[PDB]
CSV table of C-alpha atoms in Angstrom, one decimal:
chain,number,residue,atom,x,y,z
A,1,UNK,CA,-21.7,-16.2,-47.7
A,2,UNK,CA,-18.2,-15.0,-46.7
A,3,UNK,CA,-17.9,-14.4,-43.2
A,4,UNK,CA,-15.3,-12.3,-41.2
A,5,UNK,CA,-13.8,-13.7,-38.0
A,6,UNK,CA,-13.4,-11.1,-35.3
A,7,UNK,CA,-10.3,-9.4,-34.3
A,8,UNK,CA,-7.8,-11.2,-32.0
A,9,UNK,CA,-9.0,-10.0,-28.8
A,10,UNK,CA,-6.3,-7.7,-27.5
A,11,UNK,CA,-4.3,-8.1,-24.6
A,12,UNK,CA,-3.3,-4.7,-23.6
A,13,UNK,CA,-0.3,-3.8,-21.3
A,14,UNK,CA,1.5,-1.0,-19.6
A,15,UNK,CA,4.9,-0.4,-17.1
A,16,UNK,CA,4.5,-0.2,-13.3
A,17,UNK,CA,4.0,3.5,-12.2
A,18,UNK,CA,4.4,6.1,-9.2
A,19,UNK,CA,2.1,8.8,-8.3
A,20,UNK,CA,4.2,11.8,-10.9
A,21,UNK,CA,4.9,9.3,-13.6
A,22,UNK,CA,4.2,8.8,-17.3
A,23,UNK,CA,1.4,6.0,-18.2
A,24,UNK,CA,2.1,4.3,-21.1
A,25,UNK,CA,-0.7,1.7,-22.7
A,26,UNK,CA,0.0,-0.4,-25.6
A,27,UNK,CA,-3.2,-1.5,-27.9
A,28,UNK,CA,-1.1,-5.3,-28.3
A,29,UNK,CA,-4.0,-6.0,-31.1
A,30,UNK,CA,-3.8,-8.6,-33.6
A,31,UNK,CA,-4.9,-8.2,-36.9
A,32,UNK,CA,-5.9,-5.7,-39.8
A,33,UNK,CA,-7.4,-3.2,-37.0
A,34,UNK,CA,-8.6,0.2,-38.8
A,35,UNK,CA,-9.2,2.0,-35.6
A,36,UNK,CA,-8.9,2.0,-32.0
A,37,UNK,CA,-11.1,3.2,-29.1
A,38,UNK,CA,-10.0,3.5,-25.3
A,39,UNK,CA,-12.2,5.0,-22.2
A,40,UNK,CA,-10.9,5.2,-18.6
A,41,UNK,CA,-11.3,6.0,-14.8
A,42,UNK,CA,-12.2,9.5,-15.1
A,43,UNK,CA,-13.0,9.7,-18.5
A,44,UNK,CA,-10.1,9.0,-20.1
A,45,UNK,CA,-10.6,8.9,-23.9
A,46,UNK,CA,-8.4,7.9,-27.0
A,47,UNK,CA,-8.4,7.2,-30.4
A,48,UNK,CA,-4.2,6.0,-30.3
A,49,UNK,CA,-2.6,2.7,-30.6
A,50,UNK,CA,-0.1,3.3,-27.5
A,51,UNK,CA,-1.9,6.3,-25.8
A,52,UNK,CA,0.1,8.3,-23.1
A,53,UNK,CA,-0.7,10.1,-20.3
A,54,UNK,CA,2.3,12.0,-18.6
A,55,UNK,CA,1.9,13.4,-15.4
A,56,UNK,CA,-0.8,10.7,-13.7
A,57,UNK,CA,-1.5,11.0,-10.5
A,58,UNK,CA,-3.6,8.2,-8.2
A,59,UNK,CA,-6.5,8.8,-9.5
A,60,UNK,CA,-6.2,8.2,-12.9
A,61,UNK,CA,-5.4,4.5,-11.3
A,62,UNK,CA,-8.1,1.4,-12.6
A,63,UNK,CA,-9.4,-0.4,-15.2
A,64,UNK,CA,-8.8,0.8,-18.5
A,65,UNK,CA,-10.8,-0.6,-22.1
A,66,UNK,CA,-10.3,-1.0,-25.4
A,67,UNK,CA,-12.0,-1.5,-28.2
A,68,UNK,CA,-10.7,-2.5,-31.7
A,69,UNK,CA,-12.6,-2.3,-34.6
A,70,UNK,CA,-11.1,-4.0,-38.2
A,71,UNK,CA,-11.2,-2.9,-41.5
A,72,UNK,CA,-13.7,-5.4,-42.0
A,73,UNK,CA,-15.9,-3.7,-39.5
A,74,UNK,CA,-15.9,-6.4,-37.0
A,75,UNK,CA,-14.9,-5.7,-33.0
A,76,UNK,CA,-13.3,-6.8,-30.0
A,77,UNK,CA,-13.0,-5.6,-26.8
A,78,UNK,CA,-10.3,-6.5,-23.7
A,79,UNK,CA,-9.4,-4.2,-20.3
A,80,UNK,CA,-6.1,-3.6,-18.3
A,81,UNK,CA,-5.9,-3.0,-14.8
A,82,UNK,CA,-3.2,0.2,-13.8
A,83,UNK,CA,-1.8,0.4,-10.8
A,84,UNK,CA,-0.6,3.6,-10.0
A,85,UNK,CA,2.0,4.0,-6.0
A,86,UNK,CA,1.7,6.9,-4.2
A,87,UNK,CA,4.9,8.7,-3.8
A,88,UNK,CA,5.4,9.2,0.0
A,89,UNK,CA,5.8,13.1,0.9
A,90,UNK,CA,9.0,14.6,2.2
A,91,UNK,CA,9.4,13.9,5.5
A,92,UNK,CA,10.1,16.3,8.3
A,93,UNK,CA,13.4,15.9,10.4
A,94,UNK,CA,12.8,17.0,13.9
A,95,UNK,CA,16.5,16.9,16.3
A,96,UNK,CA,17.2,18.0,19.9
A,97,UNK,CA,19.3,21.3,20.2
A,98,UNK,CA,23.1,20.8,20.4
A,99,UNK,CA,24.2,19.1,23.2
A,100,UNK,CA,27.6,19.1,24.9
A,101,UNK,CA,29.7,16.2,23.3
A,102,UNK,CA,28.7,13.1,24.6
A,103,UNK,CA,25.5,13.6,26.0
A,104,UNK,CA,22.0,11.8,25.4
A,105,UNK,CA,21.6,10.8,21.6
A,106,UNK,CA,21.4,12.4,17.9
A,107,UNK,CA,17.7,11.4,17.6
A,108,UNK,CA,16.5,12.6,13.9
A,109,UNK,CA,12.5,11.9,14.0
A,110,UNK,CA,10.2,11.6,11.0
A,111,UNK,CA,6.1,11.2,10.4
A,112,UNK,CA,5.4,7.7,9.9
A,113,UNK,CA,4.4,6.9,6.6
A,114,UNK,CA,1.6,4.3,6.0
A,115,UNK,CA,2.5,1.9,3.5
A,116,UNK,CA,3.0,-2.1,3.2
A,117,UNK,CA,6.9,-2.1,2.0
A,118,UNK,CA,8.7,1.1,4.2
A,119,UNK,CA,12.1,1.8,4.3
A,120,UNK,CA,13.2,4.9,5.7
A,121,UNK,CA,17.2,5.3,4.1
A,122,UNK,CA,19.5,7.8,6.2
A,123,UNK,CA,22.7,9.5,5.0
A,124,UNK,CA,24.8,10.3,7.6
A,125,UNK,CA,27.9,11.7,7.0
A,126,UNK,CA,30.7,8.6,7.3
A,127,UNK,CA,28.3,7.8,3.8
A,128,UNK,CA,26.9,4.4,5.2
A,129,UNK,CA,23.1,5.1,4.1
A,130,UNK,CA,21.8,3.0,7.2
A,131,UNK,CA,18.4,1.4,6.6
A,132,UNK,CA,15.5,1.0,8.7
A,133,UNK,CA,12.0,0.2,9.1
A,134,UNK,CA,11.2,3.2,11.9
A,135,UNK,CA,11.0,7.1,11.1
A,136,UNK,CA,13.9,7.2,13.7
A,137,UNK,CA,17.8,7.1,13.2
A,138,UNK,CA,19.6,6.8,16.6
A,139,UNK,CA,23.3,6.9,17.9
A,140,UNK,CA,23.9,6.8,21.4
A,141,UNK,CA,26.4,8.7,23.2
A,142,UNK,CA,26.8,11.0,20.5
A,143,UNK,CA,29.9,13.0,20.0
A,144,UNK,CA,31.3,16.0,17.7
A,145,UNK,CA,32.6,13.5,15.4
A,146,UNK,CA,29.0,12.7,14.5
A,147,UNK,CA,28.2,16.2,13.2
A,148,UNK,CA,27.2,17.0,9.7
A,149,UNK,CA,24.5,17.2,7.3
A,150,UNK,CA,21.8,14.0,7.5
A,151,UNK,CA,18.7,13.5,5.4
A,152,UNK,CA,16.4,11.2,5.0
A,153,UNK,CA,14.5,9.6,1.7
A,154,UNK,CA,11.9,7.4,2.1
A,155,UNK,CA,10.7,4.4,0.3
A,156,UNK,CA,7.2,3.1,0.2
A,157,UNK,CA,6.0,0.0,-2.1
A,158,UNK,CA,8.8,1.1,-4.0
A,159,UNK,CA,8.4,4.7,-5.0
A,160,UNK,CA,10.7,7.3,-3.4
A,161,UNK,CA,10.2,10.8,-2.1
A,162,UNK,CA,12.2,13.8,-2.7
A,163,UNK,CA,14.4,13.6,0.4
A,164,UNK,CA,15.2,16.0,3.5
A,165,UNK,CA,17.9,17.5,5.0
A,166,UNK,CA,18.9,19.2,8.0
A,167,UNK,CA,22.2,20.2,10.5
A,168,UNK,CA,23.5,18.7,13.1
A,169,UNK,CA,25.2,20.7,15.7
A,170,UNK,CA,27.1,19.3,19.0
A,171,UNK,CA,29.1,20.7,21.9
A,172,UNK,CA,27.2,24.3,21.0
B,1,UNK,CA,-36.3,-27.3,-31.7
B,2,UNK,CA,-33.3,-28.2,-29.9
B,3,UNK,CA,-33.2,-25.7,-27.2
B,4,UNK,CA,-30.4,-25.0,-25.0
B,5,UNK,CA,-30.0,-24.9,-21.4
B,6,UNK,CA,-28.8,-21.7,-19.7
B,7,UNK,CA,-24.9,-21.9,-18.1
B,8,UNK,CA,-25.1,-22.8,-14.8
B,9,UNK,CA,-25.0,-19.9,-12.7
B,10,UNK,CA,-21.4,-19.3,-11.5
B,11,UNK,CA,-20.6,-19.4,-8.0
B,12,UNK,CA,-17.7,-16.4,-7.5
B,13,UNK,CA,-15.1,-16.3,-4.5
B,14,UNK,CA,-12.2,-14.5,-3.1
B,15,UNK,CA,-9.7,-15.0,-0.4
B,16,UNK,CA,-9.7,-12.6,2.7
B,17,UNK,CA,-8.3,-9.1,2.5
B,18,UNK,CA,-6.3,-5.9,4.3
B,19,UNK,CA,-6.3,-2.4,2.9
B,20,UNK,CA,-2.9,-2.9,1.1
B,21,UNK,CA,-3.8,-6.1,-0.7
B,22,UNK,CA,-4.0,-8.4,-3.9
B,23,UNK,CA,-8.0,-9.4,-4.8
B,24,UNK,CA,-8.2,-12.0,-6.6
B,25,UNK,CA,-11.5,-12.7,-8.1
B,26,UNK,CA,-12.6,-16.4,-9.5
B,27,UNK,CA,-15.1,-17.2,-11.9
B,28,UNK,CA,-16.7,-20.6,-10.8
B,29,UNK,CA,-18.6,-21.2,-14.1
B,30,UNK,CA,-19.7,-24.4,-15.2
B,31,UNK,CA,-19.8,-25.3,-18.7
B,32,UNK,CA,-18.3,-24.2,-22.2
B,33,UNK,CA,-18.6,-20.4,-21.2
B,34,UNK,CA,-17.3,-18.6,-24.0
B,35,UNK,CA,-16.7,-14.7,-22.4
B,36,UNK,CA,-16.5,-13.3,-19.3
B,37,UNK,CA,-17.3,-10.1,-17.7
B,38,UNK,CA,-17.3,-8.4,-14.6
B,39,UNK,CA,-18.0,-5.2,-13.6
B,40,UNK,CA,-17.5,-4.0,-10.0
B,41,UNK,CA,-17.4,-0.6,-7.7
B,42,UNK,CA,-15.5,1.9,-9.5
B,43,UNK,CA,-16.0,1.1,-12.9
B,44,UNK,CA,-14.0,-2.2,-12.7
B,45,UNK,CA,-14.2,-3.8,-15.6
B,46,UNK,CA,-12.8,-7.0,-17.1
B,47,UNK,CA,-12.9,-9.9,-19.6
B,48,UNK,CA,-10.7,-13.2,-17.3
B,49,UNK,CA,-11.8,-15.8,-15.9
B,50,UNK,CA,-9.5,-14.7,-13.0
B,51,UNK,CA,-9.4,-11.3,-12.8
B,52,UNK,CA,-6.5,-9.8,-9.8
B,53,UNK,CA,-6.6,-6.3,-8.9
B,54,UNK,CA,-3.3,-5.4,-7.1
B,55,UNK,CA,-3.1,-2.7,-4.5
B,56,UNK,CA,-7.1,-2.9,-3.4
B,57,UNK,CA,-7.8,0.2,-1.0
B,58,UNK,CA,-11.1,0.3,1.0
B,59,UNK,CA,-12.8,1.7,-1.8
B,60,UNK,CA,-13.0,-1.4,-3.9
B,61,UNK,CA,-15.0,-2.8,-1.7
B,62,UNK,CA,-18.5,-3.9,-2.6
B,63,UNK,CA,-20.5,-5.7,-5.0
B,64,UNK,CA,-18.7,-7.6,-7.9
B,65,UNK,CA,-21.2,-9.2,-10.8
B,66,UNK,CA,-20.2,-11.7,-12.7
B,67,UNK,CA,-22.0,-12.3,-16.5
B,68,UNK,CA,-20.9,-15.2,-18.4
B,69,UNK,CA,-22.0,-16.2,-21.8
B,70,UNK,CA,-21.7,-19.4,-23.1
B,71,UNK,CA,-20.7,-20.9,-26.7
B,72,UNK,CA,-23.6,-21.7,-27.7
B,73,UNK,CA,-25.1,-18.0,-26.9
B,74,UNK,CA,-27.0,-18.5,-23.2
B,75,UNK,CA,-26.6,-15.9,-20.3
B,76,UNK,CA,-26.2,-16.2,-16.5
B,77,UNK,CA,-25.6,-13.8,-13.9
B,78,UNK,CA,-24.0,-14.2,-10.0
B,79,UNK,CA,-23.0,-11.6,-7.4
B,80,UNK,CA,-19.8,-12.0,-4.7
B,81,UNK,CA,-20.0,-9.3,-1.8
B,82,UNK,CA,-16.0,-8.4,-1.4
B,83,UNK,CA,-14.9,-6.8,2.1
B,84,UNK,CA,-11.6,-5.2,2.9
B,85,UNK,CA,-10.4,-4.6,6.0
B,86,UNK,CA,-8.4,-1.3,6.8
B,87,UNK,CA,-5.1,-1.1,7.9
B,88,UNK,CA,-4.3,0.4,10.9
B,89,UNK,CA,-1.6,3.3,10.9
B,90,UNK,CA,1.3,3.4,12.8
B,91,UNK,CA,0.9,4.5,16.2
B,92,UNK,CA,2.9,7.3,18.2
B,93,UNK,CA,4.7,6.2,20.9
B,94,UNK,CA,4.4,8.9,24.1
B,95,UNK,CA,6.9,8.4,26.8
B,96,UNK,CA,7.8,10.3,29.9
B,97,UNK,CA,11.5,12.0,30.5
B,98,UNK,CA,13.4,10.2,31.6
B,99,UNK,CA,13.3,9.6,35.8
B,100,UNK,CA,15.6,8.4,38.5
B,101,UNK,CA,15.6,4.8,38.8
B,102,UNK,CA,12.4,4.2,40.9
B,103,UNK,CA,9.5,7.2,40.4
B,104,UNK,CA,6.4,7.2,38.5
B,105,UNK,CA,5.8,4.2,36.0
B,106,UNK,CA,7.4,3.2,32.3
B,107,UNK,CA,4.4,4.8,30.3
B,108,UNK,CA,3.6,4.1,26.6
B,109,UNK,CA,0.6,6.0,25.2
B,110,UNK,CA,-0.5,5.9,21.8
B,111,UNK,CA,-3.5,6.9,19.8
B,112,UNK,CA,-6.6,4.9,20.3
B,113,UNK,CA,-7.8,3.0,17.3
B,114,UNK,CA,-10.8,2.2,15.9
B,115,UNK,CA,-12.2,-1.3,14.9
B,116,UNK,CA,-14.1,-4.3,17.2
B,117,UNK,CA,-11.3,-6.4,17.6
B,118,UNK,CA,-8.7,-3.9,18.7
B,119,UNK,CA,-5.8,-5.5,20.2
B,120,UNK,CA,-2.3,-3.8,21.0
B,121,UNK,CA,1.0,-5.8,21.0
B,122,UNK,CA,3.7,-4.4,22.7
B,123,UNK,CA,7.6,-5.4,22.5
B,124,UNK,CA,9.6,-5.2,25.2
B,125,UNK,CA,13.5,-6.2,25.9
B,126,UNK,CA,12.4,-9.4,27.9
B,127,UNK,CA,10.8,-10.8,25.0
B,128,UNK,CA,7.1,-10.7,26.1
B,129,UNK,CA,5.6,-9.3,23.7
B,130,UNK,CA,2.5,-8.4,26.4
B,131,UNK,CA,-0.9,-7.6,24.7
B,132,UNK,CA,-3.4,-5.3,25.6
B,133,UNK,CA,-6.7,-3.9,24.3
B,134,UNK,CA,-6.0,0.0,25.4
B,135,UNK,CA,-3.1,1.9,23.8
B,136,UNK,CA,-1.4,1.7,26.6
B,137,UNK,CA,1.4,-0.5,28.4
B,138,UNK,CA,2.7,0.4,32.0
B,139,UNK,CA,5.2,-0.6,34.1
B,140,UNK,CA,4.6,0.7,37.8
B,141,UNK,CA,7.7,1.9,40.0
B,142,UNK,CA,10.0,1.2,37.1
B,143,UNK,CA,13.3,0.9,36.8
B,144,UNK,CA,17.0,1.0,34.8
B,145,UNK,CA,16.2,-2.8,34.4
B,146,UNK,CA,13.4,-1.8,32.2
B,147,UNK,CA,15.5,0.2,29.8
B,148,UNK,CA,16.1,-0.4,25.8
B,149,UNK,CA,13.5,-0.7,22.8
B,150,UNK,CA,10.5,-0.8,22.9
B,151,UNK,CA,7.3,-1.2,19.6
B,152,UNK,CA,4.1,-1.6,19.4
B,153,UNK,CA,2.0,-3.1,16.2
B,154,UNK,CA,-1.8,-2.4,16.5
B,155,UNK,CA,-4.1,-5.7,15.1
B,156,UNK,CA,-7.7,-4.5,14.1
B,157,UNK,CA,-9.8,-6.7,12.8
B,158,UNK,CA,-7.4,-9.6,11.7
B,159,UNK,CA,-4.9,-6.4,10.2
B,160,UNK,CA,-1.6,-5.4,11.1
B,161,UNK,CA,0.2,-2.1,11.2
B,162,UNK,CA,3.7,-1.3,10.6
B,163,UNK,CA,5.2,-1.3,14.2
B,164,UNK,CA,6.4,2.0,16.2
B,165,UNK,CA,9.5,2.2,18.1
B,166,UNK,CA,10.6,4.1,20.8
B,167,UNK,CA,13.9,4.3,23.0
B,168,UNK,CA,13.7,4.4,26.9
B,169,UNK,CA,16.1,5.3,28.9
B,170,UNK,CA,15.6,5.8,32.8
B,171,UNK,CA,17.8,7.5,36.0
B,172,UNK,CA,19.0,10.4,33.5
């Protein structure tokens, strides 16, 4: 009586991902494997070796499973768990009307974003990208020499949004 | 008839967590288990010993069972209740214009959050980091002394938000 040891239990893997990103699985099986089987989160079903999914958003995050079946009929089954980060939303730059040089402060305020890792990166125009850890970029004492375009992209568990931009005005 | 005994019932735990947190499950089987696997609250699924799921919202909280099967072909079956704690969100930081040195009081209202052990941690420039359990830190007939940064972090629950951070400025 001949008997067929099972496939080598897969041990499936994928890259990190963002909310709008492209989801690529890979079926690492070992052996003569004649067909493969994969369900998911929300129904999620394929028949491919390295099945794609482009375009997945956070919901289509969890534990994935494949099956393996041999040419010699015999299965296996292992699971992946995706991780999918949301991609924080453009933020909103709120600033005081123009003030005469050298008066209060160029105050551009943002939402807060929720978030464990948040960076909130500022271009400002002497190009210095200053970094901080508040929806709030400050310069005291602010003069005309501080005017410009500023904007603001934000980083959250590293993903980044599209960024923001607006005009700032002083001495009107 | 040899007859085999069952596994011995495995004895699952975890280590406490947040909202934005790593779960990560054990197996405490005893004996030659052969396979593993756990199903949980959304469909989690998986075949480890020591299955981690990375990012754990609220939502995959719950009951987590654990079947293990040993070589020689026995069952046994255990439960672990998992519980997540939210996160607080960042709080907004409300603060009167400024005043002439001396009239009214150095407000700070934020939202009030929810949770049974709700504690507020302010930051002020002398360092005291003064905690309260209202959203709310005063300073009566205050004064340019009192002037700089000031944060708060909200703690619910043994979780911490990301801080807030507001600029005073009094006697405009």
């Amino acid at each position: 009586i001949v008997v067929n040891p099972t496939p080598v239990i897969p041990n499936p893997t994928y890259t990190p991902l963002c909310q709008l990103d492209t989801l690529f699985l890979q079926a690492n099986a070992v052996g003569p494997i004649a067909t493969y089987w994969w369900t998911g989160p929300n129904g999620f079903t394929s028949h491919l070796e390295n099945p794609v999914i482009p375009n997945i958003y956070p919901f289509n995050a969890g534990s994935y499973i494949l099956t393996v079946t041999d040419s010699l009929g015999c299965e296996a089954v292992s699971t992946v768990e995706v991780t999918i980060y949301p991609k924080p939303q453009t933020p909103t730059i709120a600033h005081n009307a123009p003030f005469c040089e050298g008066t209060n402060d160029l105050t551009l305020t943002t939402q807060a974003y929720f978030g464990t890792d948040v960076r909130y990166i500022w271009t400002l125009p002497n190009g210095n990208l200053d970094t901080t850890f508040v929806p709030s970029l400050v310069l005291p004492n602010a003069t005309v020499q501080d005017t410009g375009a500023y904007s603001l992209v934000v980083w959250i568990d590293g993903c980044l949004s599209l960024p923001a931009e607006e005009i700032i005005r002083i001495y009107p």
